[PDB]
Write a protein that binds this ligand. Structure first.
Ligand SMILES: CC(=O)N[C@H]1[C@H]([C@H](O)[C@H](O)CO)OC(C(=O)O)=C[C@@H]1O
Ligand code: NA
Length: 601
């Protein structure tokens, strides 16, 4: 219907008792009252800041808000106490409300030491406040010893925002709160902490993943539990995993390249949390995060209508500063959104009509071509909307001088639709990888996708590592093969975890999988770190793998984050070798996110 988006501040830094306010948690009580919670930070820091958990209630569906109250009061006088990083969880069967948060004294998350005793001042404790009166008053407990079944778990905190209650399946009624832990190897792991007796007792399931951080769970149309996590190893995306046992244990963790993220919190909720299992509505998810890889800005709502397999719909709600954000579904069918604009804590309301999307995810294959050429690629629209669309159009976004055009056949409820894109690349186009955005426009809303057009590059999927001088595999994944996976987010990194690792020169050699006319190498430096950057280099080629011709090119790369070209007169080769002679500021290691080869495939 009529689009709604409205916003109001609930806490402004410096006003009402605190110089800084952060870390939003938002819920709707069984009453329909809204509760917003967040930290008061007297010293403006995370734990062990002597922080308070605070709370405002709205009893008119979000429009006006009552006084800021204290849920858990920090102690600014020695001995210091801090309570920080709230997450609400409503038990909608009993009505009891929970607010999870840290109890810190001397140590925060990084500094916490092994041990579970409630009074240990060097332990970052796991606390929870329980309300049996709709969030008006609160009792308090430390559950650290209940949720630390591994003595090597020296640290934990509840991921702030909002936990869930399961509605489906053998574990219906389970309360699930996400936590992050630090194990004895010092890896950050995710784990669900859950209660099956309505909050009386809590336990941890099995920890999952490495390079995890604040993570969130949601129940899918089929009762599976989807985990969606911040990556503390800073890939520039979200991490994901799924459980088939109600949160007890998760399958393998993967990087989700549909969801750019700058290492920041986020929220994932059911659009229709009361929809029955397996129903079309049960499959609808909303996601909120900063949709940038390098900054906490471009806050964006995405929608999936297939239990999170695809995210065809997105809309920006905050082009500027946008840090933590947390969604909840309101009784009136609209959505609550509590987030950090930079000046404290702000609350927004929006409806689906504002989002403006259509559940019609679509695919366009990646395609490779030569300068000058024209190719037509197929478009497949999977229509999940249930509605007929007689006049879809496809709008494409490509290089300013490329000829692109597209079209889609009418959409039919429950059916796949065919389309086509025709692309002409002008002669003289620089070899490289080109992202093309595509929008499906309909009177019932829009969906989008991207696809890659490769001009004058060899196919990486035919390549393999012929040799490498050095690679770290023990303390991180710096495999040489990471240069040819088509992902700027994974990288080769020379060995670093032993002191006897070599320094420069470093060397990586690719087998192209067969002989090609080649004329260039494209280097992309590591994206999330700046002290392993190749400077001086040479490139050699070979027909047999053993007799190397060259250097066929040499120079000095810049610090640019974009692919860098090193071109050479065209020749036939089956192998190409990069010799990295130096690092930009004289450091010991090399790291390369991607190597592309210019040539006739
Ligand atoms: C328990 C406390 O540390 N939580 C902090 C959390 C944490 O330090 C980090 O997630 C560790 O990786 O980070 C952030 C952040 O804005 O980045 C805010 C939190 O209040
Ligand atoms: Na890579």
């Amino acid at each position: 219907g009529e689009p709604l988006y409205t916003e109001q501040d609930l806490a402004v830094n410096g006003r009402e008792g605190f110089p800084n306010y952060r870390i939003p948690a938002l819920t709707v009580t069984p009453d329909g009252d809204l509760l917003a919670s967040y930290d008061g930070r007297p010293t403006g820091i995370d734990a062990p800041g002597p922080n308070s958990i605070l709370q405002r209630r709205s009893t008119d569906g979000g429009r006006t808000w009552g006084e800021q109250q204290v849920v858990s009061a920090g102690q600014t006088t020695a001995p210091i106490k801090g309570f920080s990083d709230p997450s609400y969880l409503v038990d909608r069967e009993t009505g009891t409300i929970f607010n999870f948060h840290v109890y810190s004294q001397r140590q925060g998350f990084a500094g916490s030491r092994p041990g579970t005793d409630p009074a240990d001042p060097n332990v970052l404790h796991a606390n929870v406040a329980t309300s049996t009166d709709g969030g008006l008053t609160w009792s308090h407990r430390t559950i650290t010893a209940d949720i630390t079944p591994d003595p090597g778990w020296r640290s934990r905190f509840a991921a702030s925002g909002e936990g869930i209650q399961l509605r489906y399946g053998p574990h219906a009624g389970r309360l699930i709160q996400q936590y992050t832990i630090i194990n004895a190897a010092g890896a950050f792991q995710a784990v669900s902490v859950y209660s099956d007796d309505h909050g009386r007792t809590w336990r941890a399931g099995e920890a999952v993943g490495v390079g995890m951080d604040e993570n969130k769970t949601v129940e899918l149309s089929d009762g599976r539990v989807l985990l969606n996590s911040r990556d503390s190893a800073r890939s520039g995306y979200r991490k994901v995993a799924v459980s088939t046992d109600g949160g007890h244990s998760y399958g393998p963790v993967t990087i989700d390249r549909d969801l750019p993220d700058p290492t920041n919190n986020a929220s994932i909720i059911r659009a229709f949390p009361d929809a029955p299992a397996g129903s079309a509505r049960a499959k609808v998810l909303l996601f909120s995060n900063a949709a940038s890889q390098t900054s906490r800005s471009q806050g964006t709502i995405r929608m999936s209508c297939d239990d999170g397999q695809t995210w065809p719909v997105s809309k920006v709600f905050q082009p500027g500063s946008m840090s933590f954000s947390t969604l909840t579904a309101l009784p009136d069918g609209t959505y609550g959104l509590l987030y950090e604009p930079g000046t404290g804590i702000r609350y927004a309301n929006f409806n689906l009509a504002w989002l403006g999307g259509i559940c019609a995810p679509f695919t366009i294959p990646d395609v490779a071509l030569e300068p000058g050429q024209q190719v037509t690629v197929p478009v497949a629209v999977t229509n999940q909307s249930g509605i007929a669309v007689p006049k879809p159009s496809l709008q494409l976004d490509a290089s300013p001088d490329w000829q692109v055009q597209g079209s889609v056949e009418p959409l039919m409820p429950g059916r796949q639709a065919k389309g086509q894109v025709t692309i002409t690349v002008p002669a003289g186009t620089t070899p490289g990888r080109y992202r093309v955005g595509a929008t499906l426009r309909t009177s019932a809303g829009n969906a989008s996708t991207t696809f890659t057009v490769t001009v004058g590059l060899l196919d990486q999927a035919r390549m393999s590592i012929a040799d490498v001088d050095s690679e770290e595999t023990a303390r991180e994944d710096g495999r040489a093969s990471n240069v040819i996976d088509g992902n700027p987010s994974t990288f080769w990194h020379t060995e670093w975890s032993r002191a006897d690792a070599p320094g420069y020169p470093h060397r990586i050699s690719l087998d192209l999988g067969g002989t090609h006319t080649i004329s260039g190498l494209q280097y992309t430096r590591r994206q999330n770190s700046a002290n392993e950057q190749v400077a001086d280099y040479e490139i050699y080629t070979s027909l047999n793998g053993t007799t190397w011709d060259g250097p066929v090119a040499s120079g000095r790369f810049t610090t640019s984050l974009a692919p860098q070209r090193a071109v050479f007169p065209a020749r036939d080769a089956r192998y190409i070798r990069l010799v990295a002679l130096s690092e930009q500021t004289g450091h010991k290691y090399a790291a390369v996110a991607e190597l592309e080869v210019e040539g006739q495939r």
